[PDB]
Amino acid sequence: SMQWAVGRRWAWAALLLAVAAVLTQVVWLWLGTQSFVFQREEIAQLARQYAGLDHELAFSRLIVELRRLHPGHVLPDEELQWVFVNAGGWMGAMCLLHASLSEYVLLFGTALGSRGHSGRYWAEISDTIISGTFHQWREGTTKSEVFYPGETVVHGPGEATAVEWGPNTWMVEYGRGVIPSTLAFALADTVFSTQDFLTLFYTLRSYARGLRLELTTYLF
Amino acid sequence: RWAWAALLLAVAAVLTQVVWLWLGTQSFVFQREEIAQLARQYAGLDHELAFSRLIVELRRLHPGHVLPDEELQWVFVNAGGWMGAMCLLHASLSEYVLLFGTALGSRGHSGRYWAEISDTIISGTFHQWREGTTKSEVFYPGETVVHGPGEATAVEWGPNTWMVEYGRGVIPSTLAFALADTVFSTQDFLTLFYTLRSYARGLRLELTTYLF
Amino acid sequence: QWAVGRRWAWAALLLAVAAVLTQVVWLWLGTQSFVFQREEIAQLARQYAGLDHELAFSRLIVELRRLHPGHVLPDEELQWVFVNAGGWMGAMCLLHASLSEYVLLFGTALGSRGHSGRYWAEISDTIISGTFHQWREGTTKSEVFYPGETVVHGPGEATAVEWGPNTWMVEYGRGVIPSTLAFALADTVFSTQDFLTLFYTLRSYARGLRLELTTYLFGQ
Numbered sequence: 001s002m003q004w005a006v007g008r009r010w011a012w013a014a015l016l017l018a019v020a021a022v023l024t025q026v027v028w029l030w031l032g033t034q035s036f037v038f039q040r041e042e043i044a045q046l047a048r049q050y051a052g053l054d055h056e057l058a059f060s061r062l063i064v065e066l067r068r069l070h071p072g073h074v075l076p077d078e079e080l081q082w083v084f085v086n087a088g089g090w091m092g093a094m095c096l097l098h099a100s101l102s103e104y105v106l107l108f109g110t111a112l113g114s115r116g117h118s119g120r121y122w123a124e125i126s127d128t129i130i131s132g133t134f135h136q137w138r139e140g141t142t143k144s145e146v147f148y149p150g151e152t153v154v155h156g157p158g159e160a161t162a163v164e165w166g167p168n169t170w171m172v173e174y175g176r177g178v179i180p181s182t183l184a185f186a187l188a189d190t191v192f193s194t195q196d197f198l199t200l201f202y203t204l205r206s207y208a209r210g211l212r213l214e215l216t217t218y219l220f
Numbered sequence: 221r222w223a224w225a226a227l228l229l230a231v232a233a234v235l236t237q238v239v240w241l242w243l244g245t246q247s248f249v250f251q252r253e254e255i256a257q258l259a260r261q262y263a264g265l266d267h268e269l270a271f272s273r274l275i276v277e278l279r280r281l282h283p284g285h286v287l288p289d290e291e292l293q294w295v296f297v298n299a300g301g302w303m304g305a306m307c308l309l310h311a312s313l314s315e316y317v318l319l320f321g322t323a324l325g326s327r328g329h330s331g332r333y334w335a336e337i338s339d340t341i342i343s344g345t346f347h348q349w350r351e352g353t354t355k356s357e358v359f360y361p362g363e364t365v366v367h368g369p370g371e372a373t374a375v376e377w378g379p380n381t382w383m384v385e386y387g388r389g390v391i392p393s394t395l396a397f398a399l400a401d402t403v404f405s406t407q408d409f410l411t412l413f414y415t416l417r418s419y420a421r422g423l424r425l426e427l428t429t430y431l432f
Numbered sequence: 433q434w435a436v437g438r439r440w441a442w443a444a445l446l447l448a449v450a451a452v453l454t455q456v457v458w459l460w461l462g463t464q465s466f467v468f469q470r471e472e473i474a475q476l477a478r479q480y481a482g483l484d485h486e487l488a489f490s491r492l493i494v495e496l497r498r499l500h501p502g503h504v505l506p507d508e509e510l511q512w513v514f515v516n517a518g519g520w521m522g523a524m525c526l527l528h529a530s531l532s533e534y535v536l537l538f539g540t541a542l543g544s545r546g547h548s549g550r551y552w553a554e555i556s557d558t559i560i561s562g563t564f565h566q567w568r569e570g571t572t573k574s575e576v577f578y579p580g581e582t583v584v585h586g587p588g589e590a591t592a593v594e595w596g597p598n599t600w601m602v603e604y605g606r607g608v609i610p611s612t613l614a615f616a617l618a619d620t621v622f623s624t625q626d627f628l629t630l631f632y633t634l635r636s637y638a639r640g641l642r643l644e645l646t647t648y649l650f651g652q
């Protein structure tokens with residue numbers, strides 16, 4: 001029965017080829033087995049419930065419920081920090097609740113109102129208004145739409161609009177895509193207009209804390 | 221090889237003489253009062269219909285100098301801290317005609333250009349604050365505001381403000397100011413490319429029309 | 433007599449220059465003197481608030497020249513020059529400037545909004561006319577200031593600022609003024625590219641420094 005035997009060297013090389021193929025195929029399914037922590041419309045449906053309250057208590061109760069629903073995915077009270085944001089000609093403030101390489105969640109708004117450029121991200125951005133007014137002017141048009149508390153503005157990837165927030169506008173924001181590339185835009189005016197390097201450090205530290213949380217949760 | 225430099229500078233001098241004579245003997249396609257009156261006739265119409273009528277009338281008054289509908293594109297413009305949108309109808313190295321405005325209003329720096337700019341308001345308001353002064357002026361639909369070369373002002377467009385702009389001077393120099401916030405504030409390279417492509421299309425049209 | 437090591441005398445000279453530089457910096461701080469008191473400019477400007485801003489500016493300039501001869505720029509060197517920074521735009525007229533102090537009339541006829549800037553200096557703004565909305569870092573509310581009031585901005589603090597139409601104020605700043613001028617020309621370089629405004633601003637600083645140097649060296 002010499003025709004049933006298999007040499008050892010050919011078997012070793014064939015198993016190397018087999019593991020090569022298996023690894024090159026199961027690496028692909030990592031994009032097919034993608035798992036987002038939050039559903040796409042879950043953040044909006046969650047924030048639309050707290051829009052009736054004042055934005056302070058609304059933020060507090062929303063953070064409580066978001067920690068209850070996704071334990072180990074929201075930054076603790078020790079690392080929650082309002083930091084300024086200057087980009088595209090507008091200025092607001094953010095408080096980062098969750099931050100990964102594919103997702104981010106943050107409270108965002110302005111107490112004075114601000115106008116400017118929305119930016120062109122490799123990400124989809126949802127903004128659910130808790131208070132105030134939002135004015136969006138889409139590219140190519142000559143008109144603008146207004147959004148009120150409870151409503152959600154969706155901003156697809158690659159799109160560019162003109163944005164205007166009235167006085168005392170506050171919203172939650174969810175972002176799915178290449179988050180670092182968006183962080184590149186959200187710090188342009190901070191570098192070339194405001195020179196507020198302390199704010200740069202604060203935003204980068206918030207991102208680092210979010211990533212540390214998302215990694216320590218994956219390991220425990 | 222010492223005479224090669226002499227021949228090079230000789231050809232260069234003759235070419236510069238040709239260029240100087242051509243720049244001096246060049247006429248202008250449009251007139252300031254022409255654009256002003258055309259934009260003033262339509263100021264009572266809704267800005268969409270006014271834009272359309274003005275484009276058709278400019279096409280029939282100067283054929284071969286207005287871009288076709290396939291090359292007409294609205295492009296955002298972030299400059300001097302303000303953000304509007306423009307649609308280029310005509311653009312050479314000495315003139316340009318465009319439609320400008322904003323649906324949200326915007327404030328910022330007018331720019332320090334090497335050119336004279338004329339804006340006839342179709343709709344909205346235009347607040348101009350001149351350098352060295354402590355008060356501002358306001359222009360309403362139908363009126364024209366002139367920004368002279370070397371002048372810098374503060375500008376404020378109210379919500380839903382649209383105008384027709386006619387600029388005359390060293391047009392390539394305004395590109396530095398018009399795209400500064402695009403590079404350092406918005407990082408919108410796609411809009412930068414759209415702007416450069418509109419300029420290139422205008423130059424292509426003018427060249428082919430001059431050559432027939 | 434004995435020798436010292438190549439690393440021994442090195443650290444010894446390091447400690448020597450440390451002692452020298454520290455005690456010299458302390459001697460410098462000890463001899464530091466200020467032309468204007470911490471609240472002098474505000475107290476003086478509040479007296480002229482409420483009038484027409486032109487008349488208030490003229491009377492305040494006359495009063496400052498009377499109270500501090502040799503520290504206020506002459507009429508031929510007074511000039512309104514635009515300022516673009518942190519996304520906002522206004523106009524300034526410098527009356528006094530050194531490496532540690534400065535005084536200027538500031539304001540806008542259109543109103544503006546933007547980043548106040550994070551300085552190594554304490555800056556007070558006394559309002560002659562208009563409105564001043566301030567949004568402090570870490571808060572979701574804003575404070576409005578009317579003519580007669582003074583807004584103090586501490587070193588290291590960063591706020592969002594908004595001036596209503598026809599807002600005019602007097603301002604006194606104390607600290608590392610060059611660091612403030614670094615921010616004061618950000619949009620002028622990366623946004624407006626108005627090099628003539630940059631020249632006007634730097635020439636005003638040079639004139640203030642020249643007046644201060646002449647008065648320090650020759651009195652009067």
Ligand SMILES: CCCN(CCC)CCc1ccc(OC)c(OCCc2ccccc2)c1
Binds near residue numbers: 085096125182183
């Ligand atoms: C309408 C609201 C403005 N929309 C534009 C959508 C049309 C952007 C708002 C935003 C603020 C702030 C942002 O961050 C400064 C930011 O980008 C997130 C990048 C980041 C930040 C910290 C940690 C991790 C990742 C985006």
Ligand SMILES: CCCN(CCC)CCc1ccc(OC)c(OCCc2ccccc2)c1
Binds near residue numbers: 308366395415
């Ligand atoms: C109403 C105030 C705005 N006024 C200031 C002076 C009245 C300028 C508005 C403008 C916008 C946008 C402009 O171009 C983006 C622009 O310059 C046009 C030159 C160009 C550049 C590239 C391609 C074709 C033409 C000018």
Ligand SMILES: CCCN(CCC)CCc1ccc(OC)c(OCCc2ccccc2)c1
Binds near residue numbers: 524549
């Ligand atoms: C937001 C309110 C503006 N508050 C900031 C206080 C938080 C500063 C106002 C200022 C404007 C503009 C300034 O410079 C243009 C400037 O610095 C003055 C120093 C100088 C500058 C040029 C020449 C000589 C001296 C200061």
